[PDB]
Design a protein around this ligand. Structure first.
Ligand code: BLF
Length: 93
């Protein structure tokens, strides 16, 4: 869904997203988009933000992730929409 060159973009997360990433064990200040997505996956999983009944839906309202993304929920199947929400929260190197 996302071009390989775009997945490999080096990015510098803003303070709030960086805190989220470091909370799930991220050890760096710069990442590829691919790596950012991994740790966001890690976060959603550990906090069980996915719906138990509809496991492709993430309810991020009232959580740090919802504050970052600006939505109450989203589907994990919509990759372009996810990238769009993330870009607000980082600076390209
Ligand atoms: O890193 C992630 N997944 C790798 C491990 N997966 C476990 C489930 O089966 C697919 C592989 C991964 N990282 C994510 C980050 C977000 Cl914000 C949203 C979803 C994901 C996933 C993910 C998930 C998922 C679902 C529920 C709870 C947690 C994660 N399913 C498939 N993917 C892949 C993916 C979706 C959208 C985008 Cl753009 C990029 C990648």
């Amino acid at each position: 869904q996302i071009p390989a060159s775009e997945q490999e973009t080096l990015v510098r997360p803003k303070p709030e997203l960086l805190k989220l990433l470091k909370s799930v064990g991220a050890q760096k200040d710069t990442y590829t988009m691919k790596e950012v997505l991994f740790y966001l996956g890690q976060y959603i999983m550990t906090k069980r933000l996915y719906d138990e009944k509809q496991q492709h839906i993430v309810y991020c309202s009232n959580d740090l992730l919802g504050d970052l993304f600006g939505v109450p929920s989203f589907s994990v199947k919509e990759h372009r929409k996810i990238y769009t929400m993330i870009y607000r929260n980082l600076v390209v190197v």
